[PDB]
Ligand binder design. Structure first.
Ligand code: HPA
Ligand code: HPA
Ligand code: HPA
Ligand SMILES: [Mg+2]
Ligand SMILES: [Mg+2]
Ligand SMILES: [Mg+2]
Ligand SMILES: [Zn+2]
Ligand SMILES: [Zn+2]
Ligand SMILES: [Zn+2]
Lengths: 270, 270, 270
């Protein structure tokens, strides 16, 4: 993996190249990267220019009177990266002094009540790769970050979920805010019909290929976490059509505007 | 992994060592290797003599007026091979100009209606190792082969399944052709009772240790896929007997003759 | 991995540094390490002094008139060790002439009928990492140890389970001996609520992060296996408290005394 020092160096480099001092880190994923704008006093860095960062920009700025750092593009295991690389940035954020992490993503809907365009607050997750030992904490533990056996049952901050449901009310949305279980699998291919039925019977509400690893690490080093998925699909019958990456579209399709205001409004609630 | 070039080289070597130009690739697995005979204008190559091939023979010839290339022996992850090695041959076939792939295997029956000696057309699969990131597509994507996020819900060609059920009718078999969900796990030990019950509740019909990876790759680079399992077992009560590799026997026990004619007859149906 | 020779060397070194010739190997895990005492003619070795051993002491002695070798501390995959390292000692034991293996551990209870302080005889297991290919037998097979495809449906010796339920009767315990399915996942974080519900619906009774690999290897080279879990937890509602490693406590809380006599009494039953 990386050593404590590597994290530190990277955090020190950041601190001396910007005056920004974020309190919140937001990780934007798969077609979610619309908030660049809305940001005030923005400063951007290419991942390539930040020492030790994995092979895509880091932007600092103020969101709604709140100092943020945003990950514009994230890392996936299906790209060939080990989880210790995918989660490297989470640890740096903690070293910058961040206290809260917002994770977001696009996912396929398993719950029949779901509709394309829906937003699902992540109340909980299912770590399939973790079932088999693929875990960002695998390996000797780093005391400076956290304990050997972190608990995960309270990962998704309850209070933030409460505020998000409140904010949405004020937004006057026509549809309700969904809430549920996100399941992570490796990708990169899309699931078969059997697979989907299986996931659904296991109690999952949405399926994707990221986020979980980042939550675990976050929770391990003490960050408060809040996350949500933008729903975009999905196939459970043997008549049909197939899943398409061109549902990056849906991420634009109406999402951006709503998502953008939602996160913005939410900033006032930390 | 291997580079595009490696595939190509291997395909070029093959093309200049044989006059055969297959349209169909068939992968024979675990005691299924009886069709060597029946083949016309046969040409065999030891995997060891073909550059870049994984550590077992490749035979070209004509089956029922159809030019084929057959993999006599396949690779398993439980042997220590990464999926990029297990699936290497699929990519070479595409580069030879193959268009259809037939995959076959031996598996333990989960569906109680199943009987030793049964043949199950694979309508769909469950990729357990894929759940955790063990996937032949893991890693940077190769555009020359296919897209980043291939769909898998229509993997098993519907039209071929229709023809196979037709051919079987004409064969006048006493028993019916089964059809169902194949689940892949890593092996090499056989499953426990708990494991089996679990697999069954997940909707699987048959369990084995191969094929899935090969399908995924196949589908990724555009081959039409058709597959089937020869059923040979399996334990779900805590009175009993245990699973034996000496059920290679069953693969002979009556299978060969039926399987052989089935595949042969099927050739006329591509 | 290790070569046959490495095992042998290690077994030879042991044999010439002690007069003890164990027949039973017991693996003590997570806060279970109380039996050091009770042992007679004890001889201890630090894992660090035994050639080839993974990075914690091996103690030989007599338990209840029975010659034993005990592993005081075991290896976990979540520590970064591959299964071939975690299971190395099992193979050495066979080479020392051991015939029976007792495995033990601490686990979280999934079965609602379970209570902290309960003892659960392991009747069967669920190998989640094995589902995905993470298996100590992965790789070329070693004939000197066992067959290529070992069966696992009769892993937990039936006769020992019968005797353990007999011994417990004589112990006059106030509560009954539980019996059930142990499920292994990688760790090191504790499970979420969703995860737990899932495991339970899959038929598991207890969940932990060890043992399974050791059983498989044991069974592969012919050892008779008996195992049990000491129950210590666990969270299935979204009111609650979280899982704590300070339930090492429970391993002391009353266990030690009972466990200690239980294993001791059991020695007379091999
Ligand atoms: O259907 C899907 N499956 C997996 N990941 C996804 N991310 C968006 N949609 C999907
Ligand atoms: O029972 C079985 N289990 C796993 N693989 C198999 N391949 C044939 N039979 C079996
Ligand atoms: O709740 C638990 N989960 C996983 N491993 C465990 N080992 C003891 N308790 C637990
Ligand atoms: Mg500036
Ligand atoms: Mg010729
Ligand atoms: Mg002595
Ligand atoms: Zn500079
Ligand atoms: Zn030549
Ligand atoms: Zn010495």
């Amino acid at each position: 993996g990386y050593t404590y020092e590597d994290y530190q160096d990277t955090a020190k480099w950041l601190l001396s190249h910007t005056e920004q001092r974020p309190q919140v880190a937001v990780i934007c994923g798969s077609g979610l990267g619309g908030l660049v704008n809305k940001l005030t006093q923005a400063q951007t860095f290419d991942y390539s220019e930040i020492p030790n960062f994995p092979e895509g920009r880091l932007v600092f700025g103020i969101l709604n009177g709140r100092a943020c750092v945003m990950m514009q593009g994230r890392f996936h295991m299906y790209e060939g990266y080990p989880f210790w690389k995918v989660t490297f940035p989470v640890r740096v954020f903690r070293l910058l002094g961040v206290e809260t992490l917002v994770v977001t993503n696009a996912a396929g809907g398993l719950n029949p009540n779901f509709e394309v365009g829906d937003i699902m607050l992540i109340r909980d997750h299912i770590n399939l790769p973790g079932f088999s030992g693929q875990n960002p904490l695998r390996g000797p533990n780093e005391e400076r970050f956290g304990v050997r056996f972190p608990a995960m049952s309270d990962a998704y901050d309850r209070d933030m979920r409460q505020k998000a449901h409140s904010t949405w009310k004020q937004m006057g949305e026509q549809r309700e805010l969904q809430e549920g279980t996100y399941v992570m699998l490796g990708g990169p291919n899309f699931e078969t019909v059997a697979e989907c039925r299986l996931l659904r019977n296991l109690g999952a509400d949405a399926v994707g290929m990221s986020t979980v690893p980042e939550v675990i690490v976050a929770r391990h080093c003490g960050l408060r976490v809040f996350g949500f998925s933008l729903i975009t699909n999905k196939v459970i019958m043997d008549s049909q059509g197939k899943a398409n990456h061109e549902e990056v579209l849906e991420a634009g399709k109406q999402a951006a505007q709503k998502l953008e205001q939602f996160v913005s409004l939410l900033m006032a609630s930390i």
